[PDB]
Amino acid sequence: QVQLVESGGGLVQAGGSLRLSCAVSGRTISTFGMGWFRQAPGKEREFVATITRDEDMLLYADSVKGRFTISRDTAKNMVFLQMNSLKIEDTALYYCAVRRDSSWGYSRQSTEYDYWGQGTQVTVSS
């Protein structure tokens, strides 16, 4: 069985911090790269941030460029994603997804992620 679980999310005061984590069954983070996506009602899923499979460096979206921090633990199959300097417009429905294959590198655009997460929602209010 292959299934993805999501945690964190919810409502966080504007200017605060939010933690996003997810786990995958049947796959390991090291072999398959992990990426995050966020969507709003009546709009197509787009990209926010991801971690390279080799773990050397990580990519942030233009709106949240140089703001978050992503960490991973290979001993427990979990993903860390801290959110900082959140804004009101940052509200959206976030997903945790895994790339289609175990190829190296990174892929932020295009629907390259075969399996998607529970789609937990994140809300920002002041």
Partner: protein, 49 residues
């Protein structure tokens, strides 16, 4: 190049005897997706063909 066309306009160029810029291409932010097979980008720079 300004000649970019759809998939039907397939092309192939052979490049020989040059010093590439793998690191610059990897760390460039303009390129949306860089997923590579068979060799890690970090090891891709050291190794070559």
């Amino acid at each position: 190049a300004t000649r970019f066309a759809s998939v039907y306009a397939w092309n192939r160029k052979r490049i020989s005897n040059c010093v590439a810029d793998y690191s610059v291409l990897y760390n460039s932010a303009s390129f949306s997706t860089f997923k590579c097979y068979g060799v890690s980008p970090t090891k891709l720079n050291d190794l070559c063909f």
